[PDB]
Symmetry: C4
Subunit: 271 residues, 4 copies
């Protein structure tokens, strides 16, 4: 979240249509729908009394005729009369379907958006693994389907002072022992070894709070479920780092002797 | 007792309604999907019918206060067949009409997308050698297996990952399952079109360096292959995965050749040899 | 006399009907596209009308041998409004009907795809500083320019390329145009949301090292910027390009700052200062 | 007797019904595809007609027990033209109606997707120099060829692979076909818009180092080019492949230039020169 005030209507039409809330989107469409039919109705009246069984010079009748015509229900009470009437008809028809074509695309465009079934460990931990302190957290796939060429970024964000004494926010991508997982299917524990190259080297808790430093995780991959790309983002604050902690294991052997995953343990950190 | 199946799906027991609507709709079996749609379809028409009755006797040639008539009218209206026997009467009737119409088409728009979303799935025409082999190639033992494209169409910027999965111990004594991506001599094939023999030279950097068969079984180690690429057939990305167990490694073996020279002098492919390993 | 325009499109004269149908349909202006469709629409109905007349007087309530009547019938039939005055008569009439219908819908299917294909294009809300500047930052002269995101939505794993294009002479004396990608202090921004000032430190490795203004004009050298990233707004990838000429480099200049404190004490972005370069 | 054709498709003889439905539907020729759809269309209506007859005389104004009438009614119903002569009668008739309707639209949804799936395929407007040349550039012999963009639209992050394919003998004495990707002086072009001359310097690392013509024929060696990039025209990825045989290498040749200055003083591109190699 980046709240702020941007100083600077139809400009971004396509974005806006995909960005709007479903209620609003439907409204807009509806509005457009009603509107255009009214317009068409007027076109009809404009010709004057060109529709069978229509109360003379009545907009309602014309309007409803226009819908029956444009939605192509074509009930059959109200009917065109004469060249002008019908031309407007064959024009509306086309208009109607084009509208459908445009509506569909929008619908589909906004409708077809997957979500990685990915869950983030509520905490990070800093603990010794393979002889160097390692910052870690872990992802669990929440669905049976697999994610291919999945990969993750662990980014430290913190404030720094320039020689000139500008106090700004700067981003550090943190080298992970494993950044790609071509086949992510159950759980993945991501690790950033801390050594003389880690921007968090020889850093205590006190020092982390002091730079007002947070940790941002971006996960992305190709989800087999949707046959489409997915991603998920999470953020941690200095205080969600459990120093010395170790993620419990979620891997079990059943009585049956069959391996298992207990995602109840997923958020549990031994200490 | 393998952790990973041949199809590449992990082999574990997992221990755990409208929440995942979109996934579920794409995940359901066609029978069910069609049912759901149908249900929704019938349902909404019934609802609309009630709306009509609610106004009371607002449809031409409808038996007074009869749901059937109203229902069927509602379908003729929403599917926009608009036969013409049953007709709206008065403002209330018609407003409901012009509302249904819109509803009908929107439904179509939503149904279509779903249909298309679930319908437009490709499958790499890719076949995996049933076995791997460890044998000397160019002066270093090399683990290899091979892929054959099963279709005439080509796969572009195809690439493959060979991942060893096995049990280990940390200095801290954590006993975990670790993944080792194994350096392949060749990982890209910009035009994968017939057969590709993937190789992982084994040297002091290979996590399987100086490892016998006994040692592989001992770490309960398997090998996972992920292939992916852009299929010209579908003009869309495809992939395929496969897994091998320690015992599907044929030591000393050599893949037979399926590549021939015809009498004509034109090269050829005999995909019967594909799974054949000389020994 | 610039090779590249500001919009990033190369500025050259190219020297070279139904050949490129699909491209052309997506490339045409909406007015024209709609016209084409319309034309096709009217055309085919006329054709069908003739088919009807050809049979001769096969439509209920149609003025004998009148094209208009047949034409309008054909539309009512193909758009499937099917009013009900004009009706088919006999096998020939109806076969043509059930053929048109199918035709109508297929047309829709084709029109839709085109519409959707041309309709579903995002545009990075990205604005480029009208100028570049060369100035000392952190103790080395640095070429820089800056991007501002014009929308509230964020761009993920955004990244940018700064490419110098200029003329050179080979030892063999070929005088060609070469591209140099210029090392940026920061080329990736996983989360681009407001403004980004891109920098190319100039040192013994920069192809523009120890280069004055005179020398830049002399190689007729320009600077091309390509930005790309995944836009949350569209949940789809976006990009933007821009180009600068030697003379849009403000030597010694410094981009002003665009971050403000409101009277309200709320922080702000004045994309008013965005193009302002102190000197 | 080339292994690979110019189109990039391997040139080999392969030695080996409803199984591959989706592929087949996208792979079929338009004529056939349309036929299939038509067939399906007619077929299902016939089926439905029978359903109607099966009930017996349930359609207004239908000649008793006549399939034609029922069939045509079925189309008017399923395409939802719903003219109004033929009308359902009784619950059975109408249920079949509201079922057909749904069926009709679903069909449309399926047809559309297919249409769109097969319809929305781009083609890089890319042209390959008919020949390669080996000549001295910047003090080392360089293998080169060149691409020209055939459209006004630009290709972004375009890139190309130059792959040598030739026969070899392993130390173990396996006589196989090996692919060598050849290091190019420039493999990426973030903005490809007019012409691009690709180069593979030949030095002690080039698999074609110190190789004459005789030696190339001898390994029956060819050169495969894969180009790919994101086409602004289609807002979608495109690619193109090409292949060259040993004998399409013009030794000592130099590509002519296609860049001109008009009388007007405006730069230009003459595609007559594109295939011309000075010697
Ligand atoms: K109708
Ligand atoms: K009617
Ligand atoms: K798409
Ligand atoms: K209709």
């Amino acid at each position: 979240s980046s709240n702020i005030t941007r100083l600077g209507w139809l400009d971004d039409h396509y974005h806006d249509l995909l960005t709007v809330s479903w209620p609003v989107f439907i409204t807009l469409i509806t509005g457009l729908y009603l509107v255009t039919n009214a317009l068409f109705a007027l076109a009809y009246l404009a010709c004057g009394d060109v529709i069978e069984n229509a109360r003379p010079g009545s907009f309602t009748d014309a309007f409803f005729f226009s819908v029956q015509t444009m939605a192509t229900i074509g009930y059959g009470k109200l009917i065109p009369i004469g060249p002008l009437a019908n031309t407007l008809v064959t024009l509306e028809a086309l208009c109607g379907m084009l509208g459908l074509a445009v509506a569909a695309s929008l619908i589909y465009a906004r409708f077809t958006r997957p979500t990685a079934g990915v869950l983030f460990s509520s905490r990070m931990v800093i603990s010794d693994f393979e002889g160097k302190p390692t910052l870690m957290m872990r992802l669990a796939n929440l669905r049976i389907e697999q994610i291919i060429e999945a990969d993750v970024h662990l980014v430290l964000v913190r404030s720094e002072i320039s020689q000139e004494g500008m106090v700004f926010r700067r981003f550090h991508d943190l080298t992970l022992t494993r950044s790609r997982s071509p086949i992510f299917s159950l759980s993945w524990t991501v690790m950033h070894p801390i050594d003389h190259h880690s921007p968090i080297y020889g850093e205590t808790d006190e020092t982390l709070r002091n730079s007002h430093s947070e940790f941002l995780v971006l996960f992305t991959g190709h989800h087999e479920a949707f046959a489409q790309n997915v991603h998920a983002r999470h953020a941690y604050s200095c205080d969600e780092i459990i120093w010395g902690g170790h993620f419990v294991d979620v891997f079990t052997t059943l009585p049956d002797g069959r391996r298992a995953l207990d995602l109840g343990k997923f958020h549990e950190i031994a200490q």
